[PDB]
Design a protein around this ligand. Structure first.
Ligand SMILES: *[C@@H]1O[C@H](CO)[C@@H](O[C@@H]2O[C@H](CO)[C@@H](O[C@@H]3O[C@H](CO[C@H]4O[C@H](CO[C@H]5O[C@H](CO)[C@@H](O)[C@H](O)[C@@H]5O)[C@@H](O)[C@H](O[C@H]5O[C@H](CO)[C@@H](O)[C@H](O)[C@@H]5O)[C@@H]4O)[C@@H](O)[C@H](O)[C@@H]3O)[C@H](O)[C@H]2NC(C)=O)[C@H](O)[C@H]1NC(C)=O
Ligand SMILES: *[C@@H]1O[C@H](CO)[C@@H](O[C@@H]2O[C@H](CO)[C@@H](O[C@@H]3O[C@H](CO[C@H]4O[C@H](CO[C@H]5O[C@H](CO)[C@@H](O)[C@H](O)[C@@H]5O)[C@@H](O)[C@H](O[C@H]5O[C@H](CO)[C@@H](O)[C@H](O)[C@@H]5O)[C@@H]4O)[C@@H](O)[C@H](O)[C@@H]3O)[C@H](O)[C@H]2NC(C)=O)[C@H](O)[C@H]1NC(C)=O
Ligand SMILES: *[C@@H]1O[C@H](CO)[C@@H](O[C@@H]2O[C@H](CO)[C@@H](O)[C@H](O)[C@H]2NC(C)=O)[C@H](O)[C@H]1NC(C)=O
Ligand SMILES: *[C@@H]1O[C@H](CO)[C@@H](O[C@@H]2O[C@H](CO)[C@@H](O)[C@H](O)[C@H]2NC(C)=O)[C@H](O)[C@H]1NC(C)=O
Ligand SMILES: *[C@@H]1O[C@H](CO)[C@@H](O[C@@H]2O[C@H](CO)[C@@H](O)[C@H](O)[C@H]2NC(C)=O)[C@H](O)[C@H]1NC(C)=O
Ligand SMILES: *[C@@H]1O[C@H](CO)[C@@H](O[C@@H]2O[C@H](CO)[C@@H](O)[C@H](O)[C@H]2NC(C)=O)[C@H](O)[C@H]1NC(C)=O
Ligand SMILES: *[C@@H]1O[C@H](CO)[C@@H](O[C@@H]2O[C@H](CO)[C@@H](O)[C@H](O)[C@H]2NC(C)=O)[C@H](O)[C@H]1NC(C)=O
Ligand SMILES: *[C@@H]1O[C@H](CO)[C@@H](O[C@@H]2O[C@H](CO)[C@@H](O)[C@H](O)[C@H]2NC(C)=O)[C@H](O)[C@H]1NC(C)=O
Ligand SMILES: C[As](C)(=O)[O-]
Ligand SMILES: C[As](C)(=O)[O-]
Ligand SMILES: C[As](C)(=O)[O-]
Lengths: 149, 424, 149, 424, 149, 424
């Protein structure tokens, strides 16, 4: 229901970002499209994903010095060190996922903000990624200009 | 009219959690992975290593490079001579090449031994040179792991008390004798009537040799082995003995059959045993049965400034000759020693026994400038902190850890949708 | 003053989430209620709190292998390991608190967004959790419908 | 009109900081806590441990389970026989049960000793069997901590040079003698006129026994103890001596009163001492005063493939009998040994001395499938990384750390309000 | 373009927070000022910076116990420990930077929110830090009152 | 009209990344830094340390505090007496002050040695007291690093078999003799006709001394050194020997010229050597050539309850007197020993040799209540985890790590602008 929410859909049905519209005759019956020209999201996602390399390269570049003269594997010590390293990798992961989440959401706020400023102010925001465009001052070619579908 | 961007996911989308935001995605990619492991020898620091070798790393060989298991640049880092071996220089048997091995390097590569194998047919009353070989290289490897440098000490200061004893010679030893130990025998000792006087000797392990500090010496404390008292008494009176003492009179080596049982193999005759011991620098003393005295004349000098675990390379002939695996077994039983072993026969490019394709592959790492770990499983670069299987010790450097691939966490890829709050 | 702010109150006075109203006769004098029917916040808080178990279980499940043949406690080494582990627990804590903070705030944005879309668009947002409802088109039964008090 | 949700806190609300958001709350709950510690014995891996015991873990006992300190499933994991003990098998005194202890397990549980206590009244010229006991179990525990396996070696290859010496027998030793050491005495040695010839012997510690590799042997290097030379000279000529040598003639054990003062307790008469030593496999030699020769006939074989710290269980009788705490003191002075000790008397269910309620509680952990740490303070499960008090070493596994409860951080609970920005 | 965006400027030109205005005659030509009286941002920045001391003091206060009887430096082990500690310091840094980023942005949202509520509701928000003030009900002394320039 | 706050940056602004938000700034400040390192001595725990010293830490000195290198509060923590030294108490040479050093402290500070230097001109047939000194303090430091406590044992229980031997005296030793070793000589041994009987003795190292547990004893196992057999035979018959044995007859010390070469400096005459050994408590035996017997009469008692690496302070005279650096070299070759050394001459305030400004600075840390690390490079407070240069081992406590300043990350300062999303 507009950028603060993610909804579920059944068997078929494409997942992603769609245009959804509202009332009309009183009461209306809603409607959801089949995805827009949001190529900015596509590009922003690619950039965000590639930006994860910095955090990963730092982790890969970190390997502890060691020296064992012993002739038989100290399996349990070996496994303990791995487990700790994996634990550290776990935290970094959680940080990266959140970092993508937050920056993508901000990129989505930037998308909505540009749309607001193109019907200014015929748009009228109703929370992020939602607008009350009054079908009075704004016909159909108008909304097409404002929301690109 | 209300117009909204609508966010939705499929059954194909799975949820990934974050600290401060979650992500929906359809695909995942692992965050990192395993670093390959290459078999063979290498070094983590090209500016601090030393190799000791023979013809197979001797750039002065007439058939170089075809006779060599390493290219020119690696060869320059070896102290090698065709025909040489640590053990050959230790004893100096007649007519064998007698190379002065010496050098410094925190990482050490040992690639000889083969020039004293059964094939060489050295006798010199040796009880079992293969056993001697294993014991010798055991002591070398043990002392080298804790040392920065190593040098042959080709002549110890020695002194015999006896004024009648003369230098021994044997038909079984090319009608001469080892450089070490020195063999002194008393012509006049005849068991007739004449027993002779107990023989005495000192030898000194120096605190330095040239530019090399000596904190430790690998020496052989040799003695004769007799089948029993009866067979000994056809040569001397009493029981056989040869005892080694420090400057205070502590027994540090030898064989004393006044208290210890004879163990000579029956009807073999007299034999010499030559166990190696690691000794501090100092002046040592010897007491022997009158007839036969043996005196150490060489050592290997080591410091205690530290080193890395060493690398020992299998040193055997092609199938046509008689080899041993004494350096393998010496390496196996010694802490801090890593053994490089071929899986196919030695087949050379110059001769049968020189310039083997597998060995050149195994040694090619010596080699590289980006090795960060060296282990008994092989060596790695610094790609990731992980490997699929354990790196067997001994090992040193920036060494990877084994984890299951399943434990390596993933990241969202493909079409991605953010999520936060409870959405309800 | 509406979801971007947390204010303090004296001795008595309940803390929590309240309804606050504005002007009128010019100039008015403000007014704050005595907490609403925000049971969604109550449920969201419970869910958020229970979601902390994942981060905690991961920490508890991580215990380093060890082996000591020594007969007397190495107290200082012992204490150093504990201190490091506690330090690690400190970071995780800070991450969890922020994670609750941020997701609760997002849950509060979702609460406000639903309210906006129920008086659409009689609401008119004025920053998160604030609205200019013009007491002209909207009487009292109206605002009751929109803001549930 | 402006309508707002209003966020406010009380004096009862405190602020919690986060990286990317703070939280106001009234209550806090600790993030985690301490793991309980259970006294007694246990294992971290049920598939790799071995117990050695006596009647109290012998499932073939006629009174089982009432005679047992462990249930059937744990008993199957013990190598036990009623009446047996490591030390009893070490010496083999007459009429005592002589069990062949052997097995493999990285974790080891030792629960005997009691069947050779003062109560058993074994004499056999023993100077002090309690002292011998402590020294024996000290050497066992020391060798077992570094070993995967253990086996009795019930017969060493031995050889005496003397052709006249015969096998000793004593009234104080049931009119026979130990299985080990063997006692050979020379009838003809009489101090009259006749001194006799110095006695000699070899014994061999093998490189293996059945399927068990031997890298180390615990053996006793026994000797007689005399009050002085004068009291010795009513039996033999010269000074008493019995010396043990390796194959080269290095003195490794014995008693030599030609250089060492006599220390026999006055008017006690002759006594035998039997210190245990850890020896490498090989053939060893003996020289003794003519009259009396002692020769080791058994050992315990160990490998050096590694083990975990061991668990030793207090092995004493009920109050009615005479016990010792030799295995406690042996354990206390030995690295890598963990001792399990009762706090109340042994009171059995089958007899006085079998099936004790406290011991069954202390051993019940042997037991569980979810022990992750074993320590001198007891054992733990893998609940949290923390414990309220230290886990005393020795210890191994996933072992918890001590921290003060105050240092354990908290999380907000109850009514919660987010905060970010400066709010001003 | 208003708080969801940071723009670049050339050689001269001051960086910071400015007032920017829009259309008019149709079509207008935009205009950006020379920084406002945002002393609240100055104070908020100082407070945020000083709040970093808590995270830093915790790190400085954590030094692992050690004991070496050895007479010659174990250089590689020494360097490995440092590298790990530096790695840990790296993560904390990344957390602190984000913590400043997020709390500053929230402080900027609080600044904008106060401005909204001072022309209420002549303001009309258009994404954070942007407003459609209709130059009809609101002259110049009005906008001066609302936006303090 | 659209009115907006506008966010913009210059070429002067650089971008800093965060997990959940980035920051633009013009300036950066480092997140943390290096902790200073102070040369000299200190302690990490004021409630558990002990100092051992001489006049330079003796608060009972008539010239205190001007004669002292530490103030009153530190002096109270020293066990010191003017004129004393560990070595002086070890031997007890005639007329020298004989202080009973004893105390407990996990951290130990040793600040003497100088009262037995060449300046003191002690002879007593000493071969080389400087060498003896170095060997003595080596053994003290070695035993002290693993011990909680230390005490002089000023009298060992001793027993000589000989009934004719009498207590030796020397002109070179003030016409008397050391407290330790005791010198017994046989008047009647004359090489004429009369050789005498081999001398015997026992001495006992106790399991405790007063309140101090003894697990280890530092003792001297002295002997005479002769140029050769010929020079010895003007005093006794046979070869010189003096051998030390444990209770079983294992040779643990001494000098035996029946097997070991004579090493006496030519025409020097008889000399005594006194190497220190670390021995377990027990009763030990001695056998000597008839004429001369030496018997240890003192020791230093140590436990094995653990300690920290020790601190040894340079103990030398002002330039006017003859010093040595024996305690420096002893410290240098001993694990766990940290040496404090001045860089300028000793110039005192009370006399030439007492109350030096540099030494007071170097010792002032003993001193402080906020030292968290002590190392061979000096000591630190707990400011940061980092130092600019390595802290040389030995070291203990909360010790800083070396990192390059470049690797220390920064934080944004000055005018700051947030950034998130892609902004495009
Ligand atoms: C025949 O041989 C018998 C065996 O040799 C001999 O019996 C021995 O006799 C001696 C002298 O009477 C007794 O000596 C006493 O030993 C105790 C126990 O010491 C051990 O344990 C203590 C710690 O005990 C404390 O904690 C335990 C729980 O862990 C409590 O039960 C106890 O009540 C205490 O609170 C420990 O401090 C000791 O440590 C010493 O030894 C170790 C090395 O072995 C060192 O590392 C350490 O630094 C220290 O020196 C020790 O481990 C002791 O507390 C007393 O002060 C006293 O020394 C023996 O107990 C006794 N042993 C046995 C098995 O019976 C017979 O006397 C002899 N017969 C004849 C006629 O000679
Ligand atoms: C009576 O006995 C006296 C004591 O035995 C004896 O005096 C000794 O005589 C010898 C020979 O003249 C001298 O030998 C010299 O020793 C020095 C010092 O070596 C020690 O320190 C060096 C490092 O020194 C460097 O760093 C220090 C600061 O730490 C600086 O002051 C110095 O200027 C240097 O820059 C070290 O390398 C040495 O290490 C050796 O020994 C250790 C083990 O002990 C090994 O681990 C190591 O691998 C190495 O072998 C050593 O610790 C040395 O530098 C010279 O080259 C030379 O060897 C002794 O100094 C001297 N000692 C005393 C106490 O006076 C008398 O000669 C004798 N009298 C008679 C008549 O015989
Ligand atoms: C759920 O939605 C996704 C896309 O929103 C669907 O993924 C597409 O599937 C086809 C065929 O599998 C691919 O060729 C497309 O490239 C996918 N699209 C994207 C954006 O990746 C998916 O099939 C849907 N799943 C279900 C169960 O209906
Ligand atoms: C941060 O908080 C969120 C919200 O409480 C956690 O999100 C939950 O994660 C689990 C498993 O990842 C999901 O099944 C739940 O549905 C999520 N809850 C909600 C409301 O979305 C998130 O896991 C926390 N982050 C971390 C790393 O623990
Ligand atoms: C501040 O506010 C809180 C609630 O907003 C008050 O907490 C209530 O206190 C009563 C009695 O102590 C409890 O029975 C209620 O369950 C509490 N409410 C909640 C939501 O937990 C608190 O008393 C107030 N404190 C002050 C000092 O006035
Ligand atoms: C992240 O930044 C915030 C804001 O600078 C820090 O919040 C401060 O924390 C202290 C103690 O927790 C409070 O007394 C201050 O009042 C807080 N400042 C503000 C403006 O709220 C927070 O501590 C930082 N997070 C961490 C884990 O360091
Ligand atoms: C970019 O902008 C910043 C400020 O926005 C300029 O920094 C000022 O520079 C002068 C002289 O260097 C200082 O005295 C001021 O204190 C600075 N202002 C602030 C807020 O710090 C900077 O000069 C600009 N850079 C360029 C290249 O034009
Ligand atoms: C979190 O995500 C952001 C956005 O993907 C990362 O920001 C990038 O960082 C690099 C170098 O710091 C910049 O050159 C890019 O321009 C940034 N991208 C954007 C879109 O701003 C950020 O580095 C990540 N955080 C961490 C600590 O890795
Ligand atoms: C192997 As080549 C011949 O040296
Ligand atoms: C204790 As049972 C009798 O064996
Ligand atoms: C140095 As003072 C005289 O003791």
């Amino acid at each position: 229901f507009g950028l603060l929410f993610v909804g579920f859909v059944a068997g078929g049905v494409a997942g992603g970002y769609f245009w959804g519209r509202s009332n009309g005759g009183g009461g209306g019956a809603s409607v959801s499209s089949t995805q827009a020209g949001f190529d900015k999201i596509g590009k922003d996602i690619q950039q965000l994903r590639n930006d994860t390399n910095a955090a990963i390269e730092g982790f890969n570049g970190r390997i502890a010095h060691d020296e064992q003269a012993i002739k038989n594997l100290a399996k349990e010590i070996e496994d303990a060190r791995a487990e700790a390293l994996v634990g550290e990798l776990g935290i970094i992961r959680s940080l990266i996922v959140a970092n993508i989440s937050m920056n993508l959401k901000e990129s989505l706020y930037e998308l909505a903000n540009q749309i607001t400023k193109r019907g200014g102010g015929i748009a009228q925001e109703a929370g992020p990624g939602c607008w009350y465009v009054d079908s009075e001052n704004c016909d159909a070619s108008c909304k097409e200009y404002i929301f690109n579908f | 009219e209300l117009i909204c961007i609508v966010q939705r996911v499929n059954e194909s989308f799975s949820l990934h959690s974050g600290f401060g935001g979650n992500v929906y995605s359809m695909k995942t990619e692992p965050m990192t992975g395993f670093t390959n492991v290459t078999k063979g020898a290498s070094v983590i620091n090209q500016k601090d290593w030393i190799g000791f070798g023979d013809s197979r790393t001797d750039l002065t060989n007439d058939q170089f490079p075809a006779s060599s298991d390493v290219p020119l640049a690696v060869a320059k880092k070896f102290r090698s001579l065709s025909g040489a071996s640590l053990m050959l220089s230790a004893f100096g048997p007649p007519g064998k090449v007698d190379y002065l091995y010496q050098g410094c390097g925190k990482e050490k590569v040992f690639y000889e031994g083969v020039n004293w194998s059964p094939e060489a047919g050295i006798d010199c009353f040796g009880s079992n040179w293969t056993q001697t070989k294993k014991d010798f290289y055991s002591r070398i490897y043990e002392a080298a792991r804790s040392s920065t440098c190593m040098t042959l000490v080709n002549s110890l200061d020695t002194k015999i008390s006896s004024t009648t004893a003369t230098a021994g010679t044997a038909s079984s030893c090319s009608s001469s004798w080892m450089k070490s130990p020195l063999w002194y025998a008393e012509s006049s000792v005849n068991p007739p009537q004449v027993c002779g006087t107990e023989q005495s000797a000192t030898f000194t392990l120096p605190t330095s040799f040239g530019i090399y500090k000596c904190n430790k010496h690998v020496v052989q404390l040799c003695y004769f082995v007799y089948e029993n008292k009866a067979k000994f008494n056809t040569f001397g009176c009493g029981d056989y003995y040869q005892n080694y003492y420090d400057g205070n009179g502590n027994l540090i080596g030898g064989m004393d059959n006044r208290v210890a049982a004879y163990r000579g193999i029956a009807n073999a005759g007299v034999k010499i045993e030559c166990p190696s011991k690691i000794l501090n620098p100092g002046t040592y003393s010897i007491k022997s049965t009158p007839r036969f005295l043996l005196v150490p004349k060489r050592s290997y000098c080591f410091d205690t400034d530290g080193g890395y675990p060493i690398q020992v390379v299998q040193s055997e002939w092609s199938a046509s000759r008689r080899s041993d695996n004494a350096t393998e077994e010496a390496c196996l039983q010694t802490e801090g020693c890593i053994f490089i072993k071929k899986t196919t026969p030695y087949v050379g490019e110059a001769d049968d026994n020189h310039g083997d394709i597998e060995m050149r592959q195994l040694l090619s790492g010596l080699g590289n400038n980006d090795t960060v770990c060296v282990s008994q499983s092989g060596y790695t670069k610094g790609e990731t902190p992980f490997v699929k299987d354990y790196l067997s010790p001994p090992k040193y450097g920036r060494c990877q850890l084994k984890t299951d691939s399943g434990r390596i966490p993933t990241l969202p890829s493909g079409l991605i949708i953010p999520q936060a709050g409870t959405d309800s």
